[PDB]
Every structure is written in C-alpha cells, then in structure tokens.
Structure 1
Amino acid sequence: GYRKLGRTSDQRKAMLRDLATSLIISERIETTEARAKEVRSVVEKLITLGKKGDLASRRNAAKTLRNVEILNEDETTQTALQKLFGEIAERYTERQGGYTRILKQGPRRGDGAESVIIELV
C-alpha cells in the first residue's frame, strides 16, 4: 500500500471504510493528519464511480460504503450509497479531480497529535 498507519491489514480496511462513510453523511470530520492523507484518496475514488452512474458502478461502490441511514435527505432512510450518485455527484459534475480539502488545527492535549479537518470542497 502507501502507509500502514500503525494497524494490521484487516484492521486498516475496516477503519478506512469507516471514515469514508462518515465524510459522506456529514461532509466534514475531524481526524489526525496521517489518517487524513489516506482517506483523501478513498473518498475521491468513490466520487468518480458516482459520476459514471452505471449499474456496474453502483456495485463497485457497495464494496466500500457501509450501510447507514443518512437523514440528510430527511425522509425515507436514504442510504450512504443513495446520497452518493445523487446530490454529491451533481455538485462535482464539472470538476475534474480534487474534491477534498484538509485544514490543520494544532497539537491536541494528552496526545500531541495534529488535529485536522477534512471536508468536501
């Protein structure tokens, strides 16, 4: 891969999928600097599958996104996959790459770790 992030193989894929599905329901999350550079590539590849729209793209995106009930729609229990391919894919129909922006906050208390904020542009 790219960087191990201090975990094992099976634990790393369960954590990267947890952050990607969180950046779709909230569009802005706080995390660590090293983990923000890795989820930056996981989400930007899922938006590319949403701009295609084929049935082969909806199934290639069901391997990453978890099953959560976004209430962003505010009605009918919309899934984390139904928000994708919809309002998210329409916002970046003309943008070619670079759908992520990370901002730096500072070292946190008790850990000395770089807190950051990653959000959809």
Structure 2
Amino acid sequence: YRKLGRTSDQRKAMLRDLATSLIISERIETTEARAKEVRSVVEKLITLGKKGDLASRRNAAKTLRNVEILNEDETTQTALQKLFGEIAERYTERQGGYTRILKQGPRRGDGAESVIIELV
C-alpha cells in the first residue's frame, strides 16, 4: 500500500476524509495516487453498507466522518445514512467495482496527475 507522502495517522485521516467526500459528492477531483488508494477504502465502505446489519453500520462508522448532507426539501441526513440507505440500494446487484477513475492531465502548480474518481 502507498504512503502518499504522509505519516500513518495523517494518511489515515486523509483517506477517511476523501472517502467521506466521495460519498457526499458522488465524484471528486484529486491526485492519481490518492484516488488509487481511496478506491479500496470507499469500496469496502459500500461493501459494509450492502450488508446493512447493525454491526456493519457500527463498523462503517469507524471510517466515515460526521458530515451532514442537506437533501432537497430541507431533508437532512448523515454520511452513514447516505451510505446505508441510498448507495447500498444503488449497488445491491453489483458484485464489485463501485468506482471509476478518469485520468486528467497534469495540474499547473505541480505536474501532478489530476483525476476524477466517481461512483459506479
């Protein structure tokens, strides 16, 4: 597994942040290496959401951030609720995958490979 130029605690925090953000937004722009690493994390989250039981929910709460989503009609729910209530339903028949990576060119401030990582 990659190190991403970061200590173990900082890498863990950054990966769970990136996972939560992809869950909230359904698609994010980031670096290639970080997307290659967050793919596994978010996909294991969707796997836990697909089981749906309480122990699995308690386990997925270990990784997700306490973030709030405002739906339409002023509907409000957490990232955990979105994981177990809308995204698990979207992938009940799919047996892996769950994410796609679209390489984009190098950014300007570095030569960093910017990528879109989305949900599928």
- Say yes or no: TM over 0.5: yes
Alignment length (residue pairs): 120
Q: Which runs of 4+ in 1 moved over 3 A?
A: 72-76
Distance in 1, matches of 2:71 and 2:39, equals 22
1:3 shift after superposition: 1.1
Identity of aligned residues (%): 100
Distance in 2, matches of 1:73 and 1:37, equals 32
Aligned pairs for 1:1-121 (under 5 A) are 2-72=1-71, 74-121=73-120
TM-score between the two structures when normalised by the length of structure 2: 0.96
1:39 shift after superposition: 0.1
- What is the Cα-based RMSD across aligned positions, in Å? 1.0
TM-score between the two structures when normalised by the length of structure 1: 0.95
Aligned residue for 1:112, secondary structure, equals: coil
- Unaligned regions of 5+ residues in structure 1, if any? none
- Unaligned regions of 5+ residues in structure 2, if any? none
Aligned residue for 1:74, secondary structure, equals: helix
Distance in 1, matches of 2:40 and 2:24, equals 17
| Deviation readout 1:14-52 (Å, 9 max, x if unpaired) | 100110000111000000001110000000000011111
